[PDB]
Structure 1
């Protein structure tokens, strides 16, 4: 797919018109894997939203970007970040999405230690989203703390579907090497046909993040960690004894090398560990703006 076929295809699935017609005061707040993030205001209502501006000339696999807009444009789930509109502006894809005040889980796991009630709440939210997604044949493929956002009141939402893929009866598996090194499933690194189960492994790594503050082999270069993940026995927790038997049991069902033996999102939703989940209000204290 050439650059022009890409822009054209993109132009075909994005909203027509210029967002500058109803969006004001754009203000950069950060950036991502291939662009920047800004906050803006909807003219008519004064409602604040977040805008993801992506550089089309920096997309490694531009097919994946197309998949993100097509598959998730109208997606609606309480634990999934909502996309309002998308626009093709020159050589940039602008995606207008909801603004989540709580930030990403990354900032939390790297500056504080969550209790088990907070961890269960996060796992539960992510698992509710994945169970619905997986049932529809949608695989996220980039589960990690960075992909998890929080609302001001503590609700958990899955975002960053930039690496997502679709499977079906006709095409039950994918083989693309995608995701983030430290969180990649061993079967995916091995380049073996894989399915939704890879999200479950990545989630397990995110659990290690919540307990330890970082994923396994985080002290190793990405390509080296990938080799270790693919060839070594499942990773272990540094703060092993600081977690309960319930959390350890839960984790053991996530980090199973053989995907056929790994638990599924649906099965995990009934695991005793998630019964400890606290309400959204328990997540609030974790946010940077509220941490001491």
Structure 2
């Protein structure tokens, strides 16, 4: 337990910390006793059986004063939602394509290991200092036994796939719907229906037509078609992560270096208000 120097709360329940001897910066989540501890092991187990630079790594865990502290990989730039909040600016298409290419590679890896993240949103896509996006928060992630369906209506309402809500079976492409809602969230700062009660939105996601941009005239043909390919209400006709990595919006992404200015800006704003 005293092998880490726990520092400020990141952003919740995650803290910045330093592994005292190696000097390495880690992110530690504080989990209470009354939590569903079988679900916490399921969360840690999914993280352990993942080995990808596009998925947040698990380092270990410890008990302190009845709490379970889960040690994980620290991403210096924060979440894409933190960067949008910090700068008070939505993301331009060039930024969205680059971040979403890495997110799709994480999704591709997870789905190949027959796992559904179930909570894809800008808040759970984390960027490192270099600009590499990683999937984080496997607290609601489900495991598929074979090419099998899941029935748990779980996730966050505005980002949930219609078939998850409909209670019919669902597989890995439920995350592709969430990716589409997230792409709109990065472009507009909020997902569709964000200013409506989340239980009212849950009710209309399967009956309403697939969401589109609030101002479609500002976005390119590629970004609007990418979002259209993500938001297909019928999961059997929804594109997989492997296919979306070939879509022009993603195939044409610029390198991670184009994110340097937003990362520097967001980090400078975080540091300036800390003092």
TM-score under structure 1 length normalisation: 0.86
Counterpart of 2:57?
A: 82
Unaligned runs of 5+ residues in structure 1 are 1-18
Q: Using the TM superposition, name which of 245-254 and 113-122 deviates more.
A: 113-122
Query: Are the counterparts in 1 of residues 164 and 174 from structure 2 also a CA contact under 8 Å?
Result: yes
The corresponding residue for 1:165 is 142
TM-score by length of 2: 0.91
Q: Measured at CA, do residues 232 and 92 of structure 1 come closer, stay the same or move farther in structure 2, by a change above 3 Å?
A: same
SS in 2 for 1:56: coil
C-alpha distance after superposition, 1:196-249 (max 9, x if no partner): 011000000000011111101101111011112122111121131111101111
Written as runs of structure 1 = structure 2, the 5 A alignment for 1:57-206 is: 57=34, 59=35, 61-110=36-85, 111-169=88-146, 172-206=148-182
Question: Which consecutive aligned stretches of 4+ in structure 1 deviate over 4 angstroms post-superposition?
Answer: none
CA distance in 1, matches of 2:166, 2:182: 20
Kindly tell me the number of residue pairs found equivalent between the two proteins.
Answer: 265
1:47-92 Cα distance to aligned partner (Å, 9 max, x none):
22111111131x3x54432211112125221111111112244532
Decide whether the 8 Å contact of 2:11 with 2:78 is kept in 1: no
Which range moved further: 100-109 or 246-255? 100-109
Q: Distance in 1 between matches of 2:64 and 2:207?
A: 44
RMSD between superposed Cα atoms in Å: 1.7
> In 2, distance between residues paired with 1:271 and 1:102?
27
The equivalent position to 1:289 in structure 2, one of 258, 267, 273, is 267
Could you give the per-residue CA deviations for residues 165-188 of structure 1, whole angstroms, max 9, x where no partner exists?
100228x11011111111001110
Contact kept in structure 2, 1:64 and 1:164, CA below 8 Å: no
Q: Is this contact kept in 2: 1:139–1:196, CA < 8 A?
A: yes
